[PDB]
Write a protein that binds this DNA or RNA. Structure first.
Ligand SMILES: Nc1nc2c(ncn2[C@H]2C[C@H](O)[C@@H](COP(=O)(O)OP(=O)(O)OP(=O)(O)O)O2)c(=O)[nH]1
Ligand SMILES: [Ca+2]
Ligand SMILES: [K+]
Length: 430
DNA sequence: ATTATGACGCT
DNA sequence: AGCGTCAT
């Protein structure tokens, strides 16, 4: 009743760049704009592996993880842009730099949490209170929300997408109570106004379009963002959660798309997020652990407490390369050469990071995968990272992995290595 | 033979 | 610390 907290205390947005690497390449090369386009890594094996797909190409069934040769079967006119190769490996610097452009613009509006290269959460609670004070009771015009969808509307008693969007927005705005400065629905609405402004600034100042979700917490804002892509934003109110969740597959909620979500489905014999409400908190904790159980109990009611962390920079800077099938590394010369290639990329990135961000990494994590191991990492070892020197870094990595060589000969490496990974971690201010 | 990442939880 | 999960 009057005491049951409803998880409506914050305004959180999730901003996600549409098909981000494609947009980076389309900005650079206008011939790719408004075309079925994808970004690929490498080319010799089956045309390269697709990692990003324009919405025009998605209409033909092109997806990430597809080989370009197969994508071309679905879409013979598909245009391709290739990720840069440096020191024998994919080099994602162009996309990291473009991501910094976008994150710096978002940071003008509020403190952001960098969730990925192209995704950031925004805590808008304070900006919303300020904008509400500036308003002073004045209602919110639909013109301030020209790309906003209100999830679940229109409802109750046209045949074009934009017409439906406007019908729902009008129902939403008509039901608003713009007098109550503490009203969660009003706060969300002002949050959406701010996100329209943020998205307009990103597009004006970078050329990049994005989608966004606005809700009361990170999971709902993420879910909201996915409802109307591309180049649109979606408001998911607390009141919209029962209907939204009543047909929402559990796997769609961030963190439930893997083994844990599959076990929720199998153990409880349910399919949809809303079905979780029938279980007590103790029941859920009994099946899924204390933390997961409490999280599921609140999540299925629309409530989540995970804060938007003030962190605009990545916590780790890493470099990795697979050596699949017959390219696996089987000589000491080979292992050392590739460790050096990875370490030289890492040194370049770390040196730029130290100049830009006033910090230094102090730990080097070395990860490998041996041939025949189903796991992604067969072994991880840390050592001290005391100098930004690629030769020292690769010699240290070799030292921490050299005992894994089963071969009796020192020249040979067995079982061959199918992956090398160097990661700088544990940053300190400098 | 997807691949190059990056975050975070567990013990 | 080293490993596993999840994300994409
Ligand atoms: N190297 C590599 N990059 C990836 C992989 N998956 C995604 N990326 C990159 C390319 C994407 O443009 C970027 C952002 O990922 P997203 O999942 O947000 O998809 P994207 O932005 O392409 O499309 P969207 O409009 O958000 O559905 O991350 C991957 O498996 N390997
Ligand atoms: Ca994206
Ligand atoms: K993303």
């Amino acid at each position: 009743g009057p005491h049951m907290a409803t998880g409506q205390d914050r305004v959180v947005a999730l901003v996600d760049m549409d098909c981000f690497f494609v947009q980076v390449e389309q900005r650079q090369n206008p011939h790719l704009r408004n075309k079925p386009c994808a970004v690929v890594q490498y080319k010799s094996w089956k045309g390269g592996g697709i990692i990003a797909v324009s919405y025009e190409a998605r209409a033909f069934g092109v997806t990430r993880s597809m080989w370009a040769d197969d994508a071309k079967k679905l879409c013979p006119d598909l245009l391709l842009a290739q990720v840069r190769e440096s020191r024998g490996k994919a080099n994602l610097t162009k996309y990291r730099e473009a991501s910094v452009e976008v994150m710096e613009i978002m940071s003008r509006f509020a403190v952001i949490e960098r969730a990925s290269i192209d995704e950031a959460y925004v805590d808008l609670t304070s900006a919303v209170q300020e904008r509400l004070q500036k308003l002073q009771g004045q209602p919110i015009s639909a013109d301030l929300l020209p790309s906003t969808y209100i999830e679940g509307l229109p409802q109750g008693p046209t045949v074009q997408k934009e017409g439906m969007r406007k019908q729902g927005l009008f129902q939403w705005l008509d039901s608003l109570q713009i007098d109550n400065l503490t009203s969660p629905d009003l706060q969300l609405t002002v949050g959406a106004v701010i996100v329209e402004e943020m998205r307009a600034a990103i597009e004006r100042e970078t050329g990049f379009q994005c989608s966004a979700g606005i809700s009361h917490n990170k999971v709902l804002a993420k879910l909201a963002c996915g409802l109307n892509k591309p180049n649109r934003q979606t408001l998911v109110s607390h009141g919209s959660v029962p209907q939204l969740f009543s047909q929402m597959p559990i796997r769609k909620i961030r963190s439930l798309g893997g083994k844990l979500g599959a076990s929720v489905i199998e153990i409880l014999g349910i399919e949809y997020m809303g079905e979780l409400t029938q279980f007590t908190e103790s029941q859920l904790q009994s099946h899924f652990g204390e933390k997961n159980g409490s999280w599921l109990y609140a999540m299925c009611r629309g409530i989540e407490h995970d804060p938007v962390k003030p962190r605009q920079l990545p916590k780790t800077i890493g470099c990795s390369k697979n050596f699949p099938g017959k390219t696996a590394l089987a000589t000491r010369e080979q292992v050392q050469w590739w460790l050096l290639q990875l370490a030289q990329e890492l040194e370049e990135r770390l040196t730029k990071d130290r100049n830009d961000n006033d910090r230094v990494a102090t730990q080097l994590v070395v990860s490998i995968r041996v041939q025949g191991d189903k796991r992604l990492s067969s072994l991880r070892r840390c050592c001290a990272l005391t100098r930004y020197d690629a030769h020292k870094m690769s010699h240290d990595a070799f030292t921490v992995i050299k005992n894994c060589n089963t071969s009796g000969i020192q020249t040979e490496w067995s079982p061959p290595l199918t992956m090398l990974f160097l990661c700088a971690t544990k940053f300190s201010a400098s």
